[PDB]
Design a protein around this ligand. Structure first.
Ligand SMILES: O=C(O)[C@H]1CCCN1C(=O)C(CS)CS
Ligand SMILES: [Zn+2]
Ligand SMILES: [Zn+2]
Length: 229
């Protein structure tokens, strides 16, 4: 279930995988949830996405210390928006190595974010260049093309049924495709489909602004994105 830890929520998704959830008032929209992931890889922990704020992100690290009690080797953030990179300083204060798409690091200052320390680059087929993602263990990082943003990246967790679409994917029951302020409306549908094709066996799709869902999240998101063109 949903473990409440201060103002955050944690949910175990698999033996070594948890979802972190944090909330921010978006004046005119209410308190918006954002999800990321925590993965135990043997004797270390890997984080996908910060919380919205430094204070919330320090609480993620607090929860990890209580519930896992192993060092956080690295974090990867999935685009330069506040829900994914707003807590970078908390990671850096904690001594955690940080990674983002090169383009996310380029965009970070203008988006009001602190850049990650390290930049990922991607091959033509979308897979991360392995030299740029050293020691990523089971995290398989894929750039699906521009969609939710120009820099959005996605992450599969090897050894599990899980793939993380970040803010690119909404759930199968979503009424509409939101969070589109920086979206690439022409390429969105293809990028959503490319995410699905990159992780063809993943049966649990995790995303920033919906609870985990089946692969119908991907098909439904892509279908709605077809209407943006
Ligand atoms: O408000 C929007 O449309 C876009 C563009 C600016 C940030 N954004 C978001 O939705 C937030 C979550 S509220 C980050 S994914
Ligand atoms: Zn975003
Ligand atoms: Zn988001």
């Amino acid at each position: 279930g949903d473990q409440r830890f201060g103002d955050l929520v944690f949910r175990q998704l698999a033996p070594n995988v948890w979802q972190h959830t944090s909330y921010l008032d978006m004046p005119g929209f209410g308190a918006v949830a954002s999800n990321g992931l925590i993965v135990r890889d043997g004797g270390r922990v890997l984080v996908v996405d910060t919380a919205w704020t430094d204070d919330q992100t320090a609480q993620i690290l607090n929860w990890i210390k209580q519930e896992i009690n192993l060092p956080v080797a690295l974090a990867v953030v999935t685009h330069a928006h506040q829900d994914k990179m707003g807590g970078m300083d908390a990671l850096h204060a904690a001594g955690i190595a940080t990674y983002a798409n090169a383009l996310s690091n380029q965009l970070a200052p203008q988006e009001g974010m602190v850049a990650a320390q390290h930049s990922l680059t991607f091959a033509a087929n979308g897979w991360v260049e392995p030299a740029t993602a050293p020691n990523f263990g089971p995290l398989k990082v894929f750039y699906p093309g521009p969609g939710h943003t120009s820099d959005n990246i996605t992450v599969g967790i090897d050894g599990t049924d899980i793939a993380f679409g970040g803010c690119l994917i909404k759930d199968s029951k979503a009424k509409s495709l939101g969070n589109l302020g920086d979206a690439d409306t022409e390429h969105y549908a293809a990028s959503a489909r490319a995410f699905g094709a990159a992780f063809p066996k993943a049966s649990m799709i995790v995303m920033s602004h919906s609870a985990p869902d089946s692969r119908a999240a991907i098909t439904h998101t892509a279908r709605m994105a077809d209407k943006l063109r």
